[PDB]
Amino acid sequence: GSSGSSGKWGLRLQEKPALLFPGMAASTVQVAGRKDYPALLPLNESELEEQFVKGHGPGGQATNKTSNCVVLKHVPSGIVVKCHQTRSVDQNRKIARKVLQEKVDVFYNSGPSSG
């Protein structure tokens, strides 16, 4: 075997610390809080397609009969509705339009329903 040594002497220096300065304290935007800003959306009546019931085809049970049942649906939303309030087609149209408007509103303000 063998051995050895190394008397590595040395010196050092230092001084007192100095002062510092403060930093900025900015701010930023927050969440919306709410999430249902829109409601009862404008349903353009000139953008809809209606249908009229004259009877029903062979379907066994039920098989609807001739009535002033006006049918209305939303094109982009595909939601359909069948209302019958009076014997007047144009009165039933209005009533069908308002009920469809309520349904399309939530379909735009929210998502689908199980699908």
Explain briefly what this protein structure is:
By secondary structure, this protein is an alpha+beta fold. 18% of the residues lie in helices and 10% in strands. It has one helix at residues 89-109; strands at 49-52, 70-73, 80-83.
Description:
This protein has about 120 residues and is α+β, with helices and mostly antiparallel strands. The protein has a single domain, classed as Double Stranded RNA Binding Domain, CATH 3.30.160.20. It is about 20% helix and about 10% strand. It contains 1 helix and 3 strands, in the order βββα. The protein has a 3-stranded antiparallel beta sheet, covered by helices on one side. A hairpin with a 6-residue loop joins β2 and β3. It is classed as translation. Keywords: GGQ domain, release factor, translation.
